[PDB]
Design a protein around this ligand. Structure first.
Ligand code: NI
Ligand code: NI
Ligand code: NI
Lengths: 140, 21
């Protein structure tokens, strides 16, 4: 699969859910998984969003530190869903705070992390098709 | 330290979530 396309379509959906139109089965499964995750952890996401205080000064370090901590001792599909939802949080905060150019940066950072850090794990664990299979019983 | 805290909580939640599949 093309990880950049996965990132771009995911972010476009997170932003469209906030009323923002960003000029950029796997997609739909990831879409529902991320929504289920942030609905399940609504209070936690609300607290994260209120402490982000996102600025162009802090965005790169925020992203790198959260993601490094998230995968500190390894990878699983839940942590990958969390990675996408956290990227979505940063993008929504970007447009909310009239910092919409940061969305382009965040999408680049997410694509670079998926391609150059998570790729070997995704490949060794059956690829995105394995994720579709695992989450399939939770769809609809 | 905000980002370190966010990442740790996201990790915990993630591991709970994947157990729910
Ligand atoms: Ni659109
Ligand atoms: Ni890298
Ligand atoms: Ni819990």
């Amino acid at each position: 699969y093309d990880n950049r396309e996965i990132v771009m379509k995911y972010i476009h959906y997170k932003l469209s859910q906030r009323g923002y139109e960003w000029d950029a089965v796997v997609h739909l499964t990831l879409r529902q998984a991320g929504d289920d995750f942030s609905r399940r952890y609504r209070r936690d996401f609300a607290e994260m969003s209120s402490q982000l205080h996102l600025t162009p000064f802090t965005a790169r370090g925020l992203f790198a530190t959260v993601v490094e901590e998230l995968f500190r001792d390894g990878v699983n599909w839940g942590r990958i869903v969390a990675f996408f939802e956290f990227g979505g949080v940063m993008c929504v905060e970007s447009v909310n705070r009239e910092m919409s150019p940061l969305v382009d940066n965040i999408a680049l950072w997410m694509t670079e992390y998926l391609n150059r850090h998570l790729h070997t794990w995704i490949q060794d664990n059956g690829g995105w098709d394995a994720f579709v299979e695992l989450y399939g019983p939770s769809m609809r | 330290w905000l980002a370190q805290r966010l990442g740790r909580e996201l990790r915990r939640l993630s591991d709970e979530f994947v157990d729910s599949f």
